[PDB]
Amino acid sequence: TRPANHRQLTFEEIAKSAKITVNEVELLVMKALSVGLVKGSIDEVDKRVHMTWVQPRVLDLQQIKGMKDRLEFWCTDVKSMEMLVEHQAHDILT
Amino acid sequence: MVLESTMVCVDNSEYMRNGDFLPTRLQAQQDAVNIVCHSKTRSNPENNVGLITLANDCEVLTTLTPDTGRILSKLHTVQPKGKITFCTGIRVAHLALKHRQGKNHKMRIIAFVGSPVEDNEKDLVKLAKRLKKEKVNVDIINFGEEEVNTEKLTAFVNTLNGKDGTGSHLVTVPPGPSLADALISSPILAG
Amino acid sequence: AVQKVVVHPLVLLSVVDHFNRIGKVGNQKRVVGVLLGSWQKKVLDVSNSFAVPFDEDDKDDSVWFLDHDYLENMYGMFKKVNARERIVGWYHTGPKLHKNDIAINELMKRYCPNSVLVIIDVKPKDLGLPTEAYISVEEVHDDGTPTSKTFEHVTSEIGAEEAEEVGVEHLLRDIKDTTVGTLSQRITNQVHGLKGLNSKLLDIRSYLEKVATGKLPINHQIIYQLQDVFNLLPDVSLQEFVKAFYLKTNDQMVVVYLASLIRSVVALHNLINNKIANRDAEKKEG
Amino acid sequence: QFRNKVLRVLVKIYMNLEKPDFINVCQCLIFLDDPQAVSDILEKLVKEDNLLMAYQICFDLYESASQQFLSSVIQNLRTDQTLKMIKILSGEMAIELHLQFLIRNNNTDLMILKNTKDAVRNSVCHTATVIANSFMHCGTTSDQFLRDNLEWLARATNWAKFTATASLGVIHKGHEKEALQLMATYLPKDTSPGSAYQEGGGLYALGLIHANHGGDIIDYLLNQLKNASNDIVRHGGSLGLGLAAMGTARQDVYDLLKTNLYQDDAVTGEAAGLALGLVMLGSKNAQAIEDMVGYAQETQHEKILRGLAVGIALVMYGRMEEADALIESLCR
Amino acid sequence: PAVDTAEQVYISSLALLKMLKHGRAGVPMEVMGLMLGEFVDDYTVRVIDVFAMPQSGTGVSVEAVDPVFQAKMLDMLKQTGRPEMVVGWYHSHPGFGCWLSGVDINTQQSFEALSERAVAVVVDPIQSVKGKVVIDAFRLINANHEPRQTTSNLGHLNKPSIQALIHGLNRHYYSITINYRKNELEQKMLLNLHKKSWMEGLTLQDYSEHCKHNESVVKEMLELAKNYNKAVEEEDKMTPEQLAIKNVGKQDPKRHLEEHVDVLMTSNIVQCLAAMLDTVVFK
Ligand SMILES: [Zn+2]
C-alpha cells in the first residue's frame, strides 16, 4: 500500500497494524525476510524498516488501468528525451 | 500409363481392433493398401504413392516416393489408437500432393474409412467443392462397415464427380470375411 | 540449456532468398526450413540452411505439412558436401510465433533433440536485430496447472567468419557511414536505444489497454513482472544519489577539460607553424 | 509571379507609345505564356498595312516560342495573308530557308575525314568517323564521303550499320521536301533483303530529318511501327516516332509506345521509354509519370531502366518547382 | 551474332558469399562449383545461387567426383522453388589473381558447347580484403576480327590487370563486367546485420573501470606532454629533409596526444550523456 518513494515503515506503525508489541516487530520482519515475502533491512537505532520489494500480487482492472497510466507517463518522458537528443544533435547525425 | 500422385489415407483408429474383417481390420487394410500400391506402381513405373494416417489429428508417414518398400515397411507399427479426423486428414493429403515432385502428374487420394466420420454434411460438401476446383480425385473405401452405407460419403463422392465427372469412386465392402484386396476391383482397373 | 545463438549472415541471406523465391511462386505467407550448424559448449553457431517444402491452411492451425523425406535427403547431401555441419534447428520467416510452431518443433526434435527455432523477419518494421531465438521447454505452473510446452527466449546475435565479413563489407556499398566517433556513439545508441525502449513500452501499453477493456484475459504472470519492473524503476531525488552523480560528473568534466586544453595547445602550435611557413615562403618569393 | 507582373507592366508601357515595340511585347508575351495577346496583335497588324511587322513577329515567335504556344496562335488565327503567316508559324518557311543556307554555305574539308578514315583501325573508330561525318554534314544534304567510300562503309555490321543508316537522316536535317523516296532509294526494297538494322536506321533517319516537325511522317511512322516485327525495327521506329512527335502529347503515339514498352524487351524498351519521354515532354502528365515510374520499378532490364531514366527527366522538362515530389522520390 | 561488351553478369549477395566462403575454406586448392541462373536478354546473365559439389584433388588440380549429386541437387532445388539451371561454373584461384588456365579453358569449352553463353567466375579469397573482393567473369574467343561489338563505353571501364593479360586475357578469353543488383529485402537485411540490441545502447559502463581508464590515459598524457615539450624545442634545428625521417623509429608525442584526447573526449561525453538520459528515462 505504501508508495514506492516512502516505503519506510516504522516500528510503532507495524505494531499498531499487526496488533503486536514493538519488541516482536523485529522478529516478525526477520521471519518475513527469511521466508522471502519482503526484501529490505532493519534499523533498530532509528526504529524503522526499509522495504525495497514486496511479493507480486493479483491486481484488478482498476489497478491495471493505473499501471497503464503510469506507463503512459513513462513513454511520454522517453519520447520527450528522444526528440530532445535528435533535435539537438541533428547536425552530427542527419 | 497415366501419371498419378496418389496419397493413401489409412485409418489407425480404435475401431480397427475389430476382427470382423479377416484377421483384424488393421491387417486387412494392410493387405488392401499393399495391393493398391503395387497396382499403381505396375500401372506406371514413374507413378509415386505416399502414406498418411487418420489418427487423433493426422500424421504423414511417407511423402510421394516411387518405391513401395519404404511405404510398406512404415506400415508396420501402425498400432491403432484414437479417433478419425477425415476432414483434417484429407486436407493434409491435399497439401502434400499439391507439393508434388512432378507437376505433370495427376492428383489422387485413396482413403480407407474404417470408422464413423464425425464431420457434418456441410463441411464435407465444402471440402468436396474445394477439391473439385483444385482437380483432385478421391477414391473412398467404406471399410470397417461401422456404417457400411452413404455415411456422408456418397454425398462427398457424388459432389466430387458431379456432372458425369466419373473421376471419384466409393467402393462399399460388406462385413463378409473376404480379403479387402479380393473385394476391390473398381478403382484398381476401371478407374 | 543454450546460452547464446550465433547466426551467420549467409543463413539470413539464404532465408531471404527462400522467401523471395517462394513468394514469386505465389500463394504463401511464411517460409520454413532447416538450420545446419555446430555446438561450442553452450554457444550455438548456425552456419548454413536449406529450404524445405511447407504448407499450411490459413484458417486451421492443425493442417500443416512438412516434407521430412525431403528434409532427410537434402540433409544427407549437405552432409556429403560438408560433414562438420549437423542439423541444429529450424527457421521460419513468420513475423511472430504461430500456433503450429510447437508441433513443427516436435517434428524436428526427432532430428535434433535440442532444436532451436530462429525467426527471421525479412520485412522488419522496427529498430533492432532481425533474429529471435526460441527453445522449447516444459512449463510447470501453480494455478495454470496442466504443464504445457512453451517456447523460451534465448539470446541471439550475428557473427561472421573472415570470408563472410569480407563479402558483407564489399556488398555494403549501399549506405556506408562508419564514423566510429561520437557521431556513431550517438546514433547507434542513445537514439536507437530510446526508440526501442519506446517501442517495447508501447507494446506493453497496448496489451494493458486490451486487458483493461476486456479483449484479452488477465495474465497474473505478466502483471507480476510489470509490478517487478515498476518496483525496479529507481529514485533519482535521493540526496546520496545526487551527490554521487555530481561527484562523478565533476571527475569526467575534469578529464574533458584537460583534453580540450591539450587540443587547444596543439591547434596553437599548428597555427604558429603555418604562419612561419607562409612568412618564409613569402620572403623567399620576394 | 513578380516577374510576370513586371513583364505585364512592361507590355502595357510598350503598348502606350507612339510606335509600340511589338517585337519586345511579343517576347514578353512568350514569357507570360499568353498566346491570346499575340494572336490579337497579329490580327490588328493585318487589319492595318503592317505585313512586315506581322512577318517579323511570326518569325521571332517560331524561333523562340514553344510548340504549344505556336499551335494556339495558329488555332486562334484560324478561328491570303493569314495563310502566309500561318505557314511562317508552322515553320515550313524557316526550315526551308535554313536548309537553303546550309546547302549554299557548305565549306567543309574532306581531307580531314580522309585522314581519319585512313587512321581508322577498328569498329569503334569506324562508327566514330561515320558519326563525325554526319555531324560535319548535318543539314548540308551532301553525302560525298559515304558515296565515294562505299566499300569502306560496308565493313560496319549490326548497330554500326544502324548508326550508318541514321547518319543519312542526320545529314538531311530539314530536307522534308521528299524524304520518303529519299530514304527508300538508300534503303532499296528487294535489294539485299534481310537487314533489320538498316530498316530501323531508316526509320530513325526519317525521324531525325523531321525532328520537332512531324505531320504526315508521324502517321507514317505510326503505321510502320504498328506493322513492325523485328525488335531492331521496333527500336528504330520508336526513336524516330519520338523525335517526330517531340512535344506533342499525342495519345495515339503515347499508347503505341506504351504497348511497345510493355512488350518487355530490352532493345525495344530503351527506345520506347526515351520516345515516351520525348512525346510527353514538358507536360506534367500524372498518367505518364505513374506508368513510367511503375514500369521502372517493375522491370528487370537495365537497358529499359536507362531509357526510362532519360524519359522521366524529359517528361518533367521546364517545370521548375512542380517537379519537387518526383525529384525527391527518385533521389530516395 | 554480336555478343556486346555492355553485357553484365549479375551476382546475388548469396552467390557471392557462398563462393567466397567455399574458396577460403579450400585455400590451397581450386575448389569449384556450379552457378544457377537465367539468361535474360543478350545483355544480362543473372546468377542467383551457387552450390558446391563433391570434389577431390591436389594443390595442382581439382576434379568433381560424382555427377549424380549435381543432377539430384538440381532436381531437389527445383522441387523447393529454384527452377533455374546451370549457367556457368566458379572456382577459386588462391593468390594468383583472376584468370583461366588451360584446364579451366577446357572446362569452359565444354560448358560453352552445352550452352552458348555460359560463363566462368574466378574468385580469389586471400587477395580479397574487407572493402573489395577480387572476382571476374570470363568467356572464350573462337579461333578467329574482334570478339565483341562495342555499342557503349560500359565494357572499357576496368583496365585489365597485368597478370590476367600475361595469362591470356583478351587473347584466349574476354572479361564481363560484374554487377551486384539487389532487392529491397536483401538491402534491408545487409543493413540490419550490424545493428545491435537497443539495451546495449543505453547500458552504462562500470564506473570503477571507467575511472581507471581515465586515470591511466591521463598518466600517459603526462609523459607525452614532457616529450612534446622536448620535441617543440626541436623543429628549428632541423633540416627541411631531416624532419620527415626524424619520426622514424621514434614516438610522436603530438600524434599520441591527439589520439588520447579524442578517445578521452568520446568516452567521457558518451558516458555523461548516457547517465543523464537514463536519469530522466528511468523515473
Ligand atoms: Zn583455374
Alpha-carbon torsion (C273, C274, C275, C281), positive or negative:
positive
The shortest C-alpha distance from E34 to chain D (Å) reads 23
Contact D325, D318 (CB under 8 A): no
Q: Is C65 on the interface with B (CB under 8 A)?
A: yes
Strands of the B106-112 sheet, one edge to the other: B59-65, B48-53, B4-10, B106-112, B137-141, B169-171
Contact call for C223 and A61, based on CB within 8 A: no
Q: Residue E192 carries which DSSP code?
A: H
Residue E55: strand pairing partners: E64
Contact C75, C108 (CB under 8 A): no
Separation of first and last alpha carbons in chain A: 48
The number of C-alpha atoms within 13 Å of B117 and in the hemisphere containing its C-beta is 30
**Which residue on chain A is closest to E282 by alpha carbon?**
A74
The shortest C-alpha distance from C8 to chain A (Å) reads 29
CA–CA separation, C146 vs A72, rounded Å?
Answer: 35
Please report, for residues A34, A41, A49, the alpha-carbon distance to residue A30 in angstroms, rounded to integers and kept in the order given: 6, 9, 10
- Strand, coil or helix: what is E49? strand
**Measured over all CA atoms, what is the biggest interatomic distance in chain A, rounded to whole angstroms?**
66
- Strand, coil or helix: what is E201? helix
Contact call for E41 and D266, based on CB within 8 A: yes
Header resolution in angstroms:
2.8
Q: Is C81 on the interface with E (CB under 8 A)?
A: yes
Answer yes or no: is E22 a known binding residue: no
Contact call for E146 and D301, based on CB within 8 A: no
Which one of E202, E266, E276, E283 makes the best mutation probe of the A interface by having the most chain A beta carbons within 10 Å? E283
CA–CA separation, C9 vs C17, rounded Å?
Answer: 12
Q: Enumerate residues with CB within 5 Å of ligand 1 (an ion).
A: E 101, 104
Q: Which chain E residues are closer than 8 Å to C182 by Cβ?
A: 265-266, 269-270
Residue with cell 566458379: E90
Read out DSSP for C208-263?
A: HHHHHHTSS---HHHHHHHHHHHHHS--S--HHHHHHHHHHHHHHHHHHHHHHHHH
CA neighbor of E176 nearest in space, from E87, E44, E59: E44
Task: Tell me the pairing of strands B59-65 and B106-112.
Answer: unpaired
CA–CA separation, D170 vs B30, rounded Å?
Answer: 84
CA–CA separation, C135 vs C137, rounded Å?
Answer: 6
Contact C155, C43 (CB under 8 A): no
Read out DSSP for C146-180?
A: S-EEEEEEE-EEE---HHHHHHHHHHTTTS----T
Separation of first and last alpha carbons in chain E: 75
CA–CA separation, E247 vs D24, rounded Å?
Answer: 72
Burial class (CB in 10 A: 0-12, 13-18, 19+), E125: buried
Burial class (CB in 10 A: 0-12, 13-18, 19+), D262: middle
Separation of first and last alpha carbons in chain D: 30
Task: Tell me the pairing of strands B4-10 and A48-54.
Answer: unpaired
What is the Cα Rg of chain E in Å?
28
Give Cβ neighbours of residue B177 (< 8 Å, ≥ 6 apart): B20, B21, B22
Q: Which of residues 74-133 of E touch C (CB under 8 A)?
A: 76-77, 79-82, 125, 128-133
CA–CA separation, C82 vs E53, rounded Å?
Answer: 10
CA neighbor of E94 nearest in space, from E121, E120, E63, E126: E126
SS3 of D198-266: HHHHHHHHHHHHCCCCCCHHHHHHHHHHHHCCCHHHHHHHHHHHHHHCCCCCCHHHHHHHHHHHHCCCH
CA–CA separation, B167 vs B160, rounded Å?
Answer: 8
Contact C190, A49 (CB under 8 A): no
Task: Please tell me the distance between residue B94's alpha carbon and the centre of ligand 1 in angstroms.
Answer: 49
SS3 of D268-279: HHHHHHHHHHHH
**Which residue on chain E is closest to C260 by alpha carbon?**
E261
Task: Please tell me the distance between residue D315's alpha carbon and the centre of ligand 1 in angstroms.
Answer: 50
Which set of grid coordinates corresponds to residue C26?
Answer: 505465389
Counting every residue written for chain C, the total comes to: 286
CA–CA separation, D247 vs D74, rounded Å?
Answer: 16
CA–CA separation, D181 vs D195, rounded Å?
Answer: 18
CA–CA separation, D248 vs E195, rounded Å?
Answer: 52
Task: Tell me the pairing of strands E32-38 and E55-58.
Answer: unpaired
The shortest C-alpha distance from C42 to chain B (Å) reads 33
CA–CA separation, C40 vs B168, rounded Å?
Answer: 55
Residue C132: strand pairing partners: C119
Read out DSSP for A39-94?
A: EEEEETTTTEEEEEEE------HHHHHHHHHHHHHHHHHHHHHHHHHHHHHTTT--
- Strand, coil or helix: what is D17? coil
- Strand, coil or helix: what is C266? helix
Q: Which chain C residues are closer than 8 Å to B65 by Cβ?
A: 69
What is the Cα Rg of chain A in Å?
21
H-run or E-run covering D291: helix D286-298
- Strand, coil or helix: what is B146? coil
H-run or E-run covering E15: helix E13-25
Read out DSSP for E143-183?
A: ----SSB-SSSSSSSS---HHHHHHTBTTTEEEEEEE----
Q: Is C73 on the interface with E (CB under 8 A)?
A: yes
Strand boundaries in chain E, DSSP class E: 8-11, 32-38, 44-52, 55-58, 61-64, 85-92, 119-123, 135-140, 173-179
- Strand, coil or helix: what is C43? strand
**Chains touching chain C at 3 or more Cβ pairs under 8 angstroms?**
A, B, E
The percent of chain B in helix, strand and coil, each rounded to the nearest 5, is 35, 20, 45
Which set of grid coordinates corresponds to residue E163?
Answer: 597478370
Task: Tell me the pairing of strands E135-140 and B169-171.
Answer: unpaired
Task: Please tell me the distance between residue E61's alpha carbon and the centre of ligand 1 in angstroms.
Answer: 9
In single-letter form, the type of residue at position B161 comes to N
Contact D311, D274 (CB under 8 A): yes
CA–CA separation, E124 vs E161, rounded Å?
Answer: 14
Read out DSSP for D132-169?
A: HHHHHTTTT---HHHHHTHHHHTT--THHHHHHHHHHH
B23: region left, alpha or beta (phi > 0 left; psi from -120 to 50 alpha): beta
CA–CA separation, C130 vs C128, rounded Å?
Answer: 7
CA–CA separation, B65 vs B54, rounded Å?
Answer: 20
Closest partner residue to B57 (CB to CB) among C53, C55, C62 is C62
Interface A-E: count of C-beta contacts within 8 A? 8
Contact call for C166 and E270, based on CB within 8 A: no
Alpha-carbon torsion (D27, D31, D33, D34), positive or negative:
negative
The shortest C-alpha distance from E146 to chain C (Å) reads 33
SS3 of B1-59: CCCEEEEEEECCCHHHHCCCCCCCHHHHHHHHHHHHHHHHHHHCCCCEEEEEECCCCCE
CA–CA separation, D223 vs D220, rounded Å?
Answer: 5
In single-letter form, the type of residue at position B77 comes to T
- Strand, coil or helix: what is E141? coil
Contact call for C65 and B96, based on CB within 8 A: yes
In single-letter form, the type of residue at position D260 comes to N
Contact C133, C111 (CB under 8 A): no
Please report, for residues C208, E203, E282, the alpha-carbon distance to residue C201 in angstroms, rounded to integers and kept in the order given: 10, 17, 12
Q: Is D124 on the interface with E (CB under 8 A)?
A: yes
Which one of E80, E208, E264 makes the best mutation probe of the C interface by having the most chain C beta carbons within 10 Å? E80
**Chains touching chain E at 3 or more Cβ pairs under 8 angstroms?**
A, C, D
CA–CA separation, B156 vs B161, rounded Å?
Answer: 9
Chains D, C in contact: 3+ Cβ pairs under 8 A?
no
CA neighbor of A82 nearest in space, from E161, E202, D23, D254: E202
H-run or E-run covering C90: strand C86-92
Angle at E66 between CA E61 and CA E67, to 5 degrees: 110
Interface C-E: count of C-beta contacts within 8 A? 227
A67 alpha carbon, distance to own chain's centre: 13
Contact C52, C74 (CB under 8 A): yes
